[PDB]
Write a protein that binds this ligand. Structure first.
Ligand SMILES: Nc1nc2c(ncn2[C@@H]2O[C@H](COP(=O)(O)OP(=O)(O)NP(=O)(O)O)[C@@H](O)[C@H]2O)c(=O)[nH]1
Ligand SMILES: [Cl-]
Ligand SMILES: [Mg+2]
Lengths: 168, 162
């Protein structure tokens, strides 16, 4: 009558992994940047009429500590691949996060969603079309989000749950 | 080699004194930055700032006196200075080394090892070690956590050169 999902949020430094998670969990945003070491959250939600517990692992945007990061990927059931629409390097980084998940999980079919965050800002450097093309090439959804305005926040996490439910 | 001290406080209550030998003989620019930030002689420095990240089994990190949130700090030379050398290594508890955001980004943030942290060799500049008060550093660990958040405010209540 319930289900439970282990979701992992990954992506480059400063893209909004924590701000997205805190918006989902605590329904607020702060401008202050507090770099992540590691945080875990748990929340009960209803998605498509089905109640679930989400266990969300918010990771640091560094790829050092491969032993730890590999374990994050082995345990995680689905991944948000977050970049910021005003950080071109963070978008160019996306393929590396996807490749790491495939290699660690030894699979070409892992539940993932591409998330283009900071959509509220007027400093865009990554075109939406480029992001849609990349997600299409990967066969995964693309969601535009803003942790600041809450645009797309529920959508991103819920779509990832649908990708897990579909994958199974 | 100069010696500096920190008087550490927990929610303002004195915990104890830690003193450090600074390897001016091998790392003069980096040692001088930390020495001057500790006396406050340039008009800014460590007095009052907090150890914002304490992770038991690894290290105690502090030194952000500009933003007071773990993201800031500044050197006596500018916002950032180059990695001077990597002669000294993170060989065990008590090593004092610079925190950074990548190559050549030394400011004021630093860390005190509570373990051998050899994977940091060649990426962080080691410039001193605890002389007296390693027991104070070990006590600071009780206030840390896996993500480094502290359960009470751990501050440099006083600091200076001996
Ligand atoms: N305008 C705007 N700012 C955002 C948005 N999301 C995050 N930010 C800002 O971007 C900065 C970094 O966000 P944060 O969530 O900490 O990023 P992170 O990806 O978790 N960083 P790290 O890898 O260090 O853990 C903060 O100042 C935060 O307020 C967003 O949607 N819009
Ligand atoms: Cl590190
Ligand atoms: Mg974060």
């Amino acid at each position: 009558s319930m289900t439970e999902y282990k979701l992992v949020v990954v992506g480059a430094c400063g893209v909004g992994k924590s701000a997205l998670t805190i918006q989902l969990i605590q329904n607020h945003f702060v401008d202050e940047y507090d770099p992540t070491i590691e945080d875990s959250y748990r929340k009960q939600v209803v998605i498509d009429g089905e109640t679930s517990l989400l266990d969300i692992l918010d990771t640091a945007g560094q790829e050092e500590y491969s032993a730890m990061r590999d374990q994050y990927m082995r345990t995680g059931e689905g991944f948000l691949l977050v970049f910021a629409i005003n950080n071109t390097k963070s978008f160019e980084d996306i393929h590396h996060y996807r490749e790491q998940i495939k290699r660690v999980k030894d699979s070409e079919d892992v539940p993932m969603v591409l998330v283009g965050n900071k959509s509220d800002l007027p400093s865009r450097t990554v075109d939406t079309k480029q992001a849609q093309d990349l997600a299409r090439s990967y066969g995964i959804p693309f969601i535009e989000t803003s942790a600041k305005t809450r645009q797309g926040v529920d959508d991103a996490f819920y779509t990832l749950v649908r990708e897990i439910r579909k994958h199974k | 080699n100069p010696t500096v001290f920190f008087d550490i406080a927990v929610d303002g209550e004195p915990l104890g004194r830690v003193s450090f030998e600074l390897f001016a003989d091998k790392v003069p620019k980096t040692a001088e930055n930390f020495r001057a930030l500790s006396t406050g002689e340039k008009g800014f420095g460590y007095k009052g700032s907090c150890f914002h990240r304490i992770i038991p089994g690894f290290m105690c990190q502090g030194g952000d006196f500009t933003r007071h949130n773990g993201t800031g700090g500044k050197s006596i030379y500018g916002e950032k200075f180059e990695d001077e050398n990597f002669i000294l290594k993170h060989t065990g508890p008590g090593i004092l080394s610079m925190a950074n955001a990548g190559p050549n980004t030394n400011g004021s943030q630093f860390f005190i090892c509570t373990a051998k942290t050899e994977w940091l060799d060649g990426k962080h500049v080691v410039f001193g070690k605890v002389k007296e008060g390693m027991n104070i550093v070990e006590a600071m660990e009780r206030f840390g956590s896996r993500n480094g958040k502290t359960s009470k405010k751990i501050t440099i209540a006083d600091c200076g050169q001996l």
